[PDB]
Amino acid sequence: GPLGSDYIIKEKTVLLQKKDSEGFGFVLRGAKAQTPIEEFTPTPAFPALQYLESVDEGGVAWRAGLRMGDFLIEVNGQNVVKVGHRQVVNMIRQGGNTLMVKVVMVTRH
Amino acid sequence: EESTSFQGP
C-alpha cells in the first residue's frame, strides 16, 4: 500500500518420511552462530534465521508442500527462529528419516 | 550465512 509493503504469510506444518538412500530434498541456508542470536529481531518479512534456499522438484519436501524461500520456525516441535545454522542442521539430523517442520511462506501482494 | 544440502542422504 502507500504506507509500506503488503504480504501474504502462510504457515505450513509438514512431516517428511524418507528412505535412508534419499534426502529430504531441500537446501537450508541462514546465519551461523555458536548459540542462539539474541541480537536478531524477527519481522513478519524476515521471521527466522534459517530458510529453504531451494527445494528439489518432485522430492520429499516438494511433495509435502515445502517451497523455496520458506522460513523455518520449528524443527520437531522446537522453535528455531533465532537458532544458528549448525544447531538447526543438527536438530534436522536428530530425527533420522523423519522431520517435522513448521515454516512460514512470505509472498508480496 | 551458511548453506547445507539435504538433497542426498
Author numbering:
A (entry chain AAA): 651 to 759
B (entry chain EaE): 1 to 9
Paper passage:
The SHANK (SH3 and multiple ankyrin repeat domain) protein acts as a scaffolding protein located at excitatory glutamatergic synapses; it plays a crucial role in synapse formation, maintenance, function, and development. A canonical PDZ domain is usually composed of roughly 90 amino acid residues, consisting of 5–6 β-strands (βA-βF) capped by a short helix αA and a long α-helix αB, where the N- and C-terminal strands βA and βF are in mutual proximity. Significantly, PDZs possess a highly conserved carboxylate-binding loop formed by the second α-helix (αB) and the second β-strand (βB) in an antiparallel fashion; discoveries and characterization of PBMs have established that C-terminal PBMs predominate.
Here we characterize a short linear motif (SLiM) — EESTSFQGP — as an internal PBM based on its strong binding affinity towards the SHANK1 PDZ domain (SHANK1656–762 hereafter referred to as SHANK1). To obtain further insight into the molecular basis of the SHANK1/Ac-EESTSFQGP-NH2 interaction, the co-crystal structure was solved at a resolution of 1.98 Å. The crystals used for structure determination belonged to the trigonal space group P3221. X-ray crystallographic analyses on the SHANK1/Ac-EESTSFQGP-CONH2 complex identified an asymmetric tetramer with four similar protein-ligand protomers. Overall, the two SHANK1 backbones exhibit extensive overlap with an RSMD of 0.45 Å, with subtle differences within the loops, e.g. Q667-G675PDZ, G680-Q700PDZ, V705-G709PDZ and G748-T748PDZ. Loop flexibility likely contributes to adaptation for binding of the different ligands; comparing the SHANK1/Ac-EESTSFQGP-NH2 and SHANK1/GKAP PBM structures, the loops in the Ac-EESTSFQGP-NH2 bound PDZ appear slightly extended so as to accommodate the N-terminal acetyl group as well as the C-terminal extended motif [Gln (1) — Gly (2) — Pro (3)] of the internal PBM. Crucially, one of the most obvious features of C-terminal PBM recognition is the insertion of the C-terminal carboxylate group of the residue at P0 into the PDZ conserved carboxylate binding loop. Both Phe of the internal ligand and Leu of the C-terminal PBM form hydrogen bonds with three target carboxylate-binding-loop residues, F674PDZ, G675PDZ and F676PDZ, thus contributing significantly to the low-micromolar SHANK1 affinities. Ac-EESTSFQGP-NH2 Glu (-4) and GKAP PBM Ala (-4) interact with Gly680PDZ, whilst the former additionally interacts with Arg736PDZ, which may contribute to the more favourable enthalpic binding for Ac-EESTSFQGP-NH2 compared with GKAP PBM as observed in ITC experiments.
